[PDB]
Structures are given as structure tokens and as C-alpha cells.
Amino acid sequence: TIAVHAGPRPYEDQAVLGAIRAAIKGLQALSFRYEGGSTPGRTREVTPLGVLFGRSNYLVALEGKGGKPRSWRLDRMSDLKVLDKPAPPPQDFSLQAFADESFGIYHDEIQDVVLRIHKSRAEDALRWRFHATQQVTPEADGSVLVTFRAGGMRELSWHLFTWGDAVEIVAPQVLKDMMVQELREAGRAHGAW
Amino acid sequence: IAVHAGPRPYEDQAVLGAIRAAIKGLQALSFRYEGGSTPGRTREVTPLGVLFGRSNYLVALEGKGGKPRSWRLDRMSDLKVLDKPAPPPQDFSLQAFADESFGIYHDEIQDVVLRIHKSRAEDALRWRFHATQQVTPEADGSVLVTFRAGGMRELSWHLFTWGDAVEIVAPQVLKDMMVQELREAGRAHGAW
């Protein structure tokens, strides 16, 4: 296409990344050797559904007969082949559907997030999509209250940092602690205080 | 089939498809802008490509005698794909355009040089900060990372995700911003 993804990203091995699309456009299956998970290093078979690019590149897929929608890290993968073998996708499987029942994390258990964005970036708050299932509430002081139910507290905290002092983390406590700890860590190394 | 999760802005394919239509038809595209230097006027451009990231941006030439520029998608309205010839310049590369800044913002290009601590050297090696990056292994197991790019506001926002594993050795501006952001955020959130 005529689009390019700007910004930092993980490095690519398009050799292996070209092998996965070879079986979703043929509705076939794949198989690799994992380097993680509950079984350390076996070779395993899997039905492909999609890839999610992030600061870690994943691969949504179920194993063999039946399965569970879970995504394998492409860094901890070993030697795939486009099985000669068919494996059609579940019909109602949206790939965005995987991507929103958490955040830039997966399965880190879901939290009721409450943010207060001051006036200054209130209009910026309305425009911004923190999570699909979000609700923005105006307040009497022109600040706006942003609440949504999501995972990925760490990524969230990284993103809130870019809002600077326009955000006020109201809930949950794990997010406050997440942010403070991260600010203390970075603030020491770069000499902020 | 691979969209990126996280806080991606509310985007619209009704205009993303229309920009693709004007590009591959090699014809001009016009829209009115809900932003920019002029509040709400109809601009007419040669569309070149879109940038994906912190939001989505049309890269386009407006009128004749202009440099490439960027337009927030979510801020273009009432777009029409016209029948005038609008081929791209033969020299333009969208990739080279995007490479001129660490993020979206095109400002003074800086030789940035970072040091990543040994505990995260393996991650730095496997991480593409920028298209022009070189990494050199240092004696103590830490790694030096250098590249040329503008947009250090966005750079310092990313560096924060590296915790205390990253040291900014140049440019000075990137250092100052990083510290000022940390103080401000740290005061807002009660970290010190």
C-alpha cells in the first residue's frame, strides 16, 4: 500500500512474517516451535487468525482441535511452514475483537479506569479513543472525566505520561502506583530530581 | 490483516478509502479542514500517502509550488475526489518523508545518541528506534544507539517507556525536554 507506519517498532523478520499470511489467505494451518508458555520448547500446530503489531508482535491462533484465543509472541517462535492442510477461520472472528478486550497488554486483568483531563486538553480528550468502550463526562470546571474498562495498565501509563500534567488518575490504585513508580525510575536516571 | 492495539485515535475509513481512491486514480483530492492555520476552508491537494501512528495523517501537496505536508485525517471534512490530473513527483518517497522525524512532527533534524544499559541491550538490538539507527556494543555491555531525526518531543515520550535503562547523551534539547516533562508529570501525579 501507499501507507507507512511511523515511529519506533520492533525489528522485522519478514521471512517468518511472510509465512503466516501464506495460510490465512489459503485458510490453511501453520506450525512452529515455541520458546515460552507452559510447555518450554515443543513443536506445535495452530489455526491462524491475525497478527497484532505493538511493541511486541503477536499472532492470534487456536491449537489443533478446538482451542482458546491466545496470541503467541513472534520473538519466541521457531521455523513455521504453511501446512498443506486447511483451517478456515471462525466466522464471527473480528481481529479487532481480540484487540479491544484488553489494551497493549493481554489478559492482565481488566480494571475500571477513571481519568480527569483538565480543560487544556479537554477537547483533545473528546477526540481521543482510549478504549472502545469509553464514556466521557463533562464537568463544571471545564475538565472532563474519562472512564473505561480495560487492561494494559502499563501501556496506559506510558500513554498518560504524554498528556503530562493534564491528567489526574482517579482510579484504579494499581495505575497510580504504576505511574508514580515509573516516574521515580525515569526521574532518577535522567536527573529530574 | 494486522491492526495495532492500544489507544489508537477514532479513525474513519470513509476518508481513508477516498484518499486511496485519489492516489491510485492519479487525480487530485480536496477536503475542508477542521483545524490548521485557517479554521474551516476547502483545500485541494495532490495526495501522496497516509502516515499511521499516534493518529493518521494524509501526506499531500497543496497547489503547485509546495513542499509535502501532513494533515490530521480526523480533521479533514467533506472530501471530494476530483477529475484533474494529480500524479506524484517522480522523486517523492513517502518512506523518506516519514524518516525525517522520530514521529510525525517535522522539525530540526538532530543527531540523537543514546546509551542503553546492559540489562536491556538485547532489547535495544531488536528494536527499531528509527530507519537510520546504528548500534555499537560498548565495553561494559551497554549499547550506544544513534540516529538522525526530528521530533524530539515524541522521542522523549518514547524514551520514558525505557525506564532508567536509557541515558540521553545528545542532543541537549532532548535532555532538557525529558527532564522538564518528568518534573511536570511527577509533580502532577505526586511522585516527588
Domains and CATH numbers, chain B: 13-92 (2.30.30), 110-188 (3.30.70)
Closest by alpha carbon to A54, among A104, A11, A97?
A: A104
Interface contacts A/B by beta carbons within 8 Å: 168
Is-contact B110 B129, C-beta < 8 A? no
CA distance A168 to B188: 7
Please list the alpha-helical segments (H only) found in A2-74: 14-24
CA distance B35 to B3: 27
CA distance B13 to B125: 35
Q: For residue A104, is it left (φ>0), alpha (ψ between -120 and 50) or beta?
A: alpha
Give the containing element (helix H, strand E) for A91. Answer: none
Q: Residue B40 contacts by C-beta under 8 Å, 6 or more apart in sequence?
A: B32, B33, B34, B77
CB contact under 8 A, B53 and A5: yes
Q: Residue B180 contacts by C-beta under 8 Å, 6 or more apart in sequence?
A: none
CA distance A114 to A29: 42
Mutation target among A107, A131, A165 for the B interface, most CBs of B within 10 A: A165
Longest dimension (CA), chain B: 62
CA distance A57 to A46: 17
In degrees, rounded to 5, the angle at the alpha carbon of residue B32 between the alpha carbons of residues B26 and B35 is: 125
Kindly report whether the peptide bond that precedes residue A172 is cis, defined as omega within 30 degrees of 0.
yes
CA distance A175 to A181: 10
Q: What's the CA dihedral at B28, B32, B36, B39 to 10 degrees?
A: 150
Is-contact A110 A102, C-beta < 8 A? yes
Amino acid letter, residue B61: L
* A93/B contact by beta carbon, under 8 A: no
The SS3 assignment for A168 reads strand
Partners of residue B52 on adjacent β-strands: A5, B56
Q: State how far the alpha carbon of A149 is from the alpha carbons of A115, A129, A137, A171, B68, in Å.
A: 11, 13, 15, 11, 40
CA distance A46 to B185: 44
Partners of residue A31 on adjacent β-strands: A45
Cell numbers for A1, please give them. 500500500
Cell numbers for A79, please give them. 521455523
Q: Cβ of B53: how many Cβ atoms within 10 Å? A: 19
CA distance B28 to B83: 7
* A14/B contact by beta carbon, under 8 A: no
Q: Pick A24's closest partner by Cβ from B1, B24, B126.
A: B1
Q: Residue A94 contacts by C-beta under 8 Å, 6 or more apart in sequence?
A: none
Distance from CA of B36 to the nearest CA of A (A): 15
The SS3 assignment for B32 reads strand
Mutation target among A123, A129, A153 for the B interface, most CBs of B within 10 A: A129
Q: State how far the alpha carbon of A145 is from the alpha carbons of A102, A165, B12, B51, in Å.
A: 20, 15, 24, 30
CB contact under 8 A, A52 and B4: yes
Q: What's the CA dihedral at A186, A110, A36, B123 to 10 degrees?
A: -20
CB contact under 8 A, B128 and A9: yes
Q: How was this structure determined?
A: X-ray
Is-contact A113 A150, C-beta < 8 A? yes
Resolution (A): 2.5
